[model samples]
Target: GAPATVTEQGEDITSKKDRGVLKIVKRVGNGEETPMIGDKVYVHYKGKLSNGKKFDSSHDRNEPFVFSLGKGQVIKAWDIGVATMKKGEIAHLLIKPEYAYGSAGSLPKIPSNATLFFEIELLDFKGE
Candidate 1:
C-alpha cells in the first residue's frame, strides 16, 4: 500500500536536512565526524505520533540501540537521519510517512498513515 503523507508546519528548524525530506531540530555533535555506511551507532530515541503520544522509547529501558548506518535494519527516516549525526549529538527529527512505518503503522503501536517525531541521541558510534 502507498503510505499516507503528512506536512510539518512551523514548529522549528526550517532547514531541510535531507533536501526537503527531514526537519532537523538540534545539531550539535562531537567533531565533524558524521557516521558513514556500515558504521554502528548506539542511540537512545523516543518516537511519537502526530497526537504526541509516545509509542516507543529506548531511553525508558535505560538501554541504547545499535544499528548500522545505510542498512535497512530500521525505518528509512532513521537510517538517513542517523547517518547525519555524530557522537554525543542529540537531534529531533520529523519524518514523513513515506520514510516511516508506511501503510503498516509498525503493527499494534504506531497508527497507520501517521507522521512521526523522534528525539534521537547518539551516545556513541563505532566505525565499521
Candidate 2:
C-alpha cells in the first residue's frame, strides 16, 4: 500500500536546532526523569516541516502514540527522544533528516532531505 501524506509546502520555520537547513523546536517533560529502554508509553504528537507546515499528527487522528522506548518500530530520532521522557510529560523533538526519514523522505508530504518536528506527550508508562 502507499504511505500517507499530510502536509503542504511554503510554511514558516520557527525552531532553534538545525538539521541541515531545517530548524527544530523542542520541549521536555517535567514529571519524572527521562524514559529508559523497554518502557511502554502513550503519547500525543504533531509533526510538521520546518516551514511551520503540519505533516502528521496523532491528535488530528484522535489517537495516542503507543510504543516501546528504544524499539525500532519508529524513527531512530523518535526512539531516542522518547526514551528521554516520563509519564504525563511532553516533549517537542526536532528531528534531522538523518534521524528521521532521511534524504529519500517518506511519501507525499515529506520532501527529499527534509527535517521533521514531533510534539510528543508522555501520558503513561508501563514497566517492561
- Candidate maximizing TM-score: 1
lDDT of 1 by residue, 14-126 (tens): 24444224545465887888888888889998877876665679978988888888789988878777887788887777776678877778766777877877788998878
TM-score against truth, every candidate: 0.78, 0.70
Model 1 pairs in collision: none
TM-score, cand. 2 vs. native = 0.70
Candidate 1 deviation (Cα RMSD): 5.8
Worst 10 residues of 2 by lDDT: 1-10
Candidate 2 lDDT, tens digit per residue, 1-128?
00112122211232343332222223444665766788887888877886555577889889888888778888877776666566666645555687777889876777777767666777777778
Q: What are the lDDT figures for the candidates, one per model?
A: 0.71, 0.63
